[PDB]
Coordinates of C-alpha atoms in Angstrom, one line a residue:
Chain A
X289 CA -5.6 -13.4 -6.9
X290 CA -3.4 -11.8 -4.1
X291 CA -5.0 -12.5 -1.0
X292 CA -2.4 -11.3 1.9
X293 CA 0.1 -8.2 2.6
X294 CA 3.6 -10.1 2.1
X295 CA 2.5 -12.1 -1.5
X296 CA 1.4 -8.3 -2.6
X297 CA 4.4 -6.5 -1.6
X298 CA 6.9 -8.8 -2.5
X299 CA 5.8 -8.5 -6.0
X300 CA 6.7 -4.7 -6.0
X301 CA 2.9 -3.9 -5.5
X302 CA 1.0 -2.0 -3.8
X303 CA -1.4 -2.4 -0.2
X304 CA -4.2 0.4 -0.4
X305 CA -7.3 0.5 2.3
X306 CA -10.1 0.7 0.1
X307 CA -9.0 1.2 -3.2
X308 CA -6.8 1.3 -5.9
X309 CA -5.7 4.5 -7.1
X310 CA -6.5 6.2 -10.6
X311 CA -4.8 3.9 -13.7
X312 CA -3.5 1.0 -11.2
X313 CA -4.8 -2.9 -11.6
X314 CA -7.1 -4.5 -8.8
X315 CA -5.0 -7.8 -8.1
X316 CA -6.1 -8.4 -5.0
X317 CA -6.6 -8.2 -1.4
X318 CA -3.7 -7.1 1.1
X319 CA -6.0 -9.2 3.5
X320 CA -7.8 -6.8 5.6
X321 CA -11.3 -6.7 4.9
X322 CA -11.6 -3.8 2.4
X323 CA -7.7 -3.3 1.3
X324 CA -6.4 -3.5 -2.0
X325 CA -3.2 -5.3 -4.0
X326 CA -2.6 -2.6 -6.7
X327 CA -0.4 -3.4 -9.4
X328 CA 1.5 0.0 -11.7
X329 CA -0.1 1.0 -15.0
Chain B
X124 CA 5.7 2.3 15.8
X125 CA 4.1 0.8 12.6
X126 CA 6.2 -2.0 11.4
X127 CA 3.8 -4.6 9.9
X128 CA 1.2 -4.3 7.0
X129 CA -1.8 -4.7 9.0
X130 CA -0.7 -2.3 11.7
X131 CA -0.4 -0.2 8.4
X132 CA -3.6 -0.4 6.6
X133 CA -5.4 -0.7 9.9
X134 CA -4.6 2.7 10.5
X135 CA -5.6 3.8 7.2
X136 CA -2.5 3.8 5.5
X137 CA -1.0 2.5 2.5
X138 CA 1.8 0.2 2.2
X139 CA 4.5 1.2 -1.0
X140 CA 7.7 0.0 -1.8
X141 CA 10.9 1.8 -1.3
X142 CA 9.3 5.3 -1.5
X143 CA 6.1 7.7 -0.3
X144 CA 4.4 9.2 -3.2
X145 CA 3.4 12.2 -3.8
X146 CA 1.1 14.2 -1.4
X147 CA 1.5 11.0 1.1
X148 CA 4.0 11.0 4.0
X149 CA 6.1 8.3 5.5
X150 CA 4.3 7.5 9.6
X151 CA 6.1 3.9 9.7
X152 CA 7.2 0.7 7.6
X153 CA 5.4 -2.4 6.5
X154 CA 7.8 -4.4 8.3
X155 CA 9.4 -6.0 4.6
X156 CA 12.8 -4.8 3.8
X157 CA 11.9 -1.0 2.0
X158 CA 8.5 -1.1 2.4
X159 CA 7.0 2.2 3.7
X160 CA 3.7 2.9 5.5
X161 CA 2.5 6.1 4.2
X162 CA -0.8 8.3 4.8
X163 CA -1.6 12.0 3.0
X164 CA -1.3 14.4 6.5

């Protein structure tokens, strides 16, 4: 339920701009319309 | 240059901690303590 840059990177995650690559977990947004919080497999 | 998240994903970019993977290069940071903006060239 990530929602902006900081809370996702903090956490050791990861911002994408669209979407989250192959075998990562959607958590999020990074808050720009469209990007992604992607958590490791 | 690109020292912020949003500056980061704006341009297309991805925001990782501490490293670049594979295939992507470092252009910038995400402005948090090892965080690295990162786009495939």
């Amino acid at each position: 339920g990530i929602g902006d840059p900081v809370t996702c990177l903090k956490s050791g995650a990861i911002c994408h701009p669209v979407f989250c690559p192959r075998r990562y977990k959607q958590i999020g947004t990074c808050g720009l319309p469209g990007t992604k919080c992607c958590k490791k497999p």
